GROMACS .gro file of N, CA and C in nm:
model
  117
    1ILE      N    1  -0.713   1.327   1.026
    1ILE     CA    2  -0.814   1.320   1.134
    1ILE      C    3  -0.955   1.338   1.078
    2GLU      N    4  -1.034   1.232   1.086
    2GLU     CA    5  -1.171   1.235   1.036
    2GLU      C    6  -1.256   1.335   1.114
    3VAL      N    7  -1.241   1.336   1.246
    3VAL     CA    8  -1.316   1.427   1.331
    3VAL      C    9  -1.225   1.497   1.431
    4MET      N   10  -1.273   1.607   1.488
    4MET     CA   11  -1.196   1.683   1.585
    4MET      C   12  -1.271   1.702   1.717
    5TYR      N   13  -1.398   1.659   1.722
    5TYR     CA   14  -1.477   1.675   1.844
    5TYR      C   15  -1.447   1.567   1.948
    6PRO      N   16  -1.463   1.439   1.914
    6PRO     CA   17  -1.436   1.330   2.007
    6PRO      C   18  -1.287   1.305   2.027
    7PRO      N   19  -1.248   1.234   2.134
    7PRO     CA   20  -1.107   1.205   2.162
    7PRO      C   21  -1.040   1.134   2.044
    8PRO      N   22  -0.911   1.166   2.016
    8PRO     CA   23  -0.838   1.104   1.905
    8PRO      C   24  -0.797   0.962   1.936
    9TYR      N   25  -0.791   0.879   1.833
    9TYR     CA   26  -0.752   0.740   1.852
    9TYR      C   27  -0.729   0.669   1.720
   10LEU      N   28  -0.604   0.632   1.694
   10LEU     CA   29  -0.567   0.563   1.572
   10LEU      C   30  -0.449   0.470   1.596
   11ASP      N   31  -0.479   0.346   1.631
   11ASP     CA   32  -0.374   0.247   1.657
   11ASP      C   33  -0.289   0.226   1.533
   12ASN      N   34  -0.353   0.225   1.417
   12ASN     CA   35  -0.282   0.206   1.290
   12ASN      C   36  -0.198   0.328   1.253
   13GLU      N   37  -0.213   0.435   1.328
   13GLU     CA   38  -0.138   0.558   1.302
   13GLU      C   39   0.013   0.534   1.313
   14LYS      N   40   0.053   0.454   1.411
   14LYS     CA   41   0.195   0.425   1.431
   14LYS      C   42   0.255   0.358   1.307
   15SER      N   43   0.173   0.287   1.231
   15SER     CA   44   0.219   0.219   1.111
   15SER      C   45   0.269   0.320   1.009
   16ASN      N   46   0.198   0.432   0.997
   16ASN     CA   47   0.235   0.537   0.903
   16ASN      C   48   0.235   0.484   0.760
   17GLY      N   49   0.353   0.446   0.710
   17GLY     CA   50   0.362   0.395   0.574
   17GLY      C   51   0.391   0.504   0.472
   18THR      N   52   0.383   0.629   0.514
   18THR     CA   53   0.409   0.742   0.425
   18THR      C   54   0.552   0.738   0.374
   19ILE      N   55   0.641   0.676   0.451
   19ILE     CA   56   0.781   0.665   0.413
   19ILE      C   57   0.796   0.588   0.283
   20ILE      N   58   0.721   0.479   0.271
   20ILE     CA   59   0.724   0.396   0.152
   20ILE      C   60   0.862   0.333   0.133
   21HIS      N   61   0.864   0.210   0.084
   21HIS     CA   62   0.989   0.138   0.061
   21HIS      C   63   0.986   0.066  -0.073
   22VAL      N   64   1.105   0.033  -0.123
   22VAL     CA   65   1.119  -0.036  -0.250
   22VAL      C   66   1.025  -0.155  -0.259
   23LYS      N   67   0.973  -0.180  -0.379
   23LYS     CA   68   0.881  -0.290  -0.402
   23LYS      C   69   0.954  -0.424  -0.391
   24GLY      N   70   0.885  -0.524  -0.337
   24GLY     CA   71   0.944  -0.656  -0.322
   24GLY      C   72   0.984  -0.717  -0.455
   25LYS      N   73   0.900  -0.699  -0.556
   25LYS     CA   74   0.927  -0.753  -0.689
   25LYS      C   75   0.922  -0.643  -0.795
   26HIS      N   76   1.004  -0.656  -0.898
   26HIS     CA   77   1.008  -0.558  -1.006
   26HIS      C   78   0.875  -0.552  -1.079
   27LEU      N   79   0.815  -0.669  -1.100
   27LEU     CA   80   0.687  -0.677  -1.170
   27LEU      C   81   0.693  -0.604  -1.303
   28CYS      N   82   0.810  -0.603  -1.365
   28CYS     CA   83   0.829  -0.536  -1.493
   28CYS      C   84   0.762  -0.615  -1.605
   29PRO      N   85   0.736  -0.549  -1.720
   29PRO     CA   86   0.672  -0.615  -1.835
   29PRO      C   87   0.750  -0.736  -1.883
   30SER      N   88   0.678  -0.840  -1.925
   30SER     CA   89   0.741  -0.962  -1.973
   30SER      C   90   0.827  -0.933  -2.097
   31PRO      N   91   0.945  -0.997  -2.109
   31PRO     CA   92   1.035  -0.975  -2.223
   31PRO      C   93   0.973  -1.021  -2.354
   32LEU      N   94   0.888  -1.122  -2.346
   32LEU     CA   95   0.821  -1.176  -2.464
   32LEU      C   96   0.680  -1.220  -2.429
   33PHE      N   97   0.590  -1.123  -2.415
   33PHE     CA   98   0.450  -1.151  -2.382
   33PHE      C   99   0.441  -1.219  -2.245
   34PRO      N  100   0.328  -1.202  -2.174
   34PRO     CA  101   0.308  -1.262  -2.042
   34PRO      C  102   0.319  -1.413  -2.045
   35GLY      N  103   0.387  -1.465  -1.944
   35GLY     CA  104   0.406  -1.609  -1.933
   35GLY      C  105   0.275  -1.686  -1.919
   36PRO      N  106   0.181  -1.642  -1.833
   36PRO     CA  107   0.052  -1.711  -1.815
   36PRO      C  108  -0.026  -1.723  -1.945
   37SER      N  109  -0.092  -1.837  -1.963
   37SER     CA  110  -0.171  -1.862  -2.083
   37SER      C  111  -0.290  -1.952  -2.052
   38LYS      N  112  -0.403  -1.926  -2.117
   38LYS     CA  113  -0.524  -2.005  -2.097
   38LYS      C  114  -0.585  -2.045  -2.231
   39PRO      N  115  -0.662  -2.156  -2.233
   39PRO     CA  116  -0.726  -2.204  -2.355
   39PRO      C  117  -0.799  -2.094  -2.430
   0.00000   0.00000   0.00000
């Protein structure tokens, strides 16, 4: 709570997110250097 004087209001509060869930992708280090390459 940023403030305590005015009425409370946080629509995004219901989202929470504190629970946290497994990542969609492993995003682990490349087995042999990163695939992307530039000149």
